[PDB]
Design a protein around this ligand. Structure first.
Ligand code: H3Y
Length: 186
């Protein structure tokens, strides 16, 4: 099936815990895959304007590891719960993608999660101003804008609202799209 196909593809890129013990400042993100109308979508947040770190940007759910987290996956799930109300039984963490190095002293670990069909996001307004879905296929033929430096623009056909997606967030979205959708019969 579509969801089993996705999982089996994603597993071939799983690095596991290989890089998880290194002495970095640690941050995790969740890449939430949602099935809707026969197709895969990714879920994104718009960060609250009132935050000190990264106000108003399009990001995946995530945040800084804390002493309670058993591992880097736990960080990603804790933060998704706090931001959009995603509960543990509503998500299956399928793999850990390549981590991103930043600022010489920081390591960001991405996990891909399959989201239960009865989940409905409850944006927490102290953390997140908006939550929206983008079809995974979009990231193979995106609408690109040069700020000269590449930014994606996505317009939701439901309401005509446009979102800007860039940086690490846009890089990871393209990666997941290639993994899952490259070389498939139609
Ligand atoms: O997901 C975090 C991770 C990064 C970070 C986190 C902490 C310190 C430096 C850099 C930067 C890039 C990402 C884009 N949206 C938000 C975001 N911010």
């Amino acid at each position: 099936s579509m969801l089993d196909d996705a999982k089996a593809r994603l597993r071939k890129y799983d690095i596991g815990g290989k890089y998880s013990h290194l002495p970095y400042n640690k941050y995790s993100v969740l890449l939430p895959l949602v099935a809707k109308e026969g197709k895969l979508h990714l879920l994104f947040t718009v960060r609250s304007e009132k935050l000190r770190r990264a106000p108003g940007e399009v990001c995946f759910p995530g945040g800084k590891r804390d002493p309670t987290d058993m591992d880097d996956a736990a960080t990603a799930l804790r933060e998704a719960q706090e931001e959009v109300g995603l509960r543990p039984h509503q998500v299956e963490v399928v793999c850990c993608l390549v981590p991103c190095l930043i600022d010489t002293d920081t390591l960001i670990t991405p996990f891909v999660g399959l989201i239960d069909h009865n989940f409905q996001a409850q944006p927490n307004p102290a953390e997140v101003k908006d939550v929206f879905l983008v079809p995974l296929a979009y990231f193979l033929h995106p609408q690109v804008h040069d700020q000269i430096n590449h930014i994606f623009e996505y317009t939701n056909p439901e309401d005509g609202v446009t979102y800007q997606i860039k940086g690490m967030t846009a890089n990871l979205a393209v990666l997941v799209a290639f993994i899952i959708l490259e070389k498939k019969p139609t």
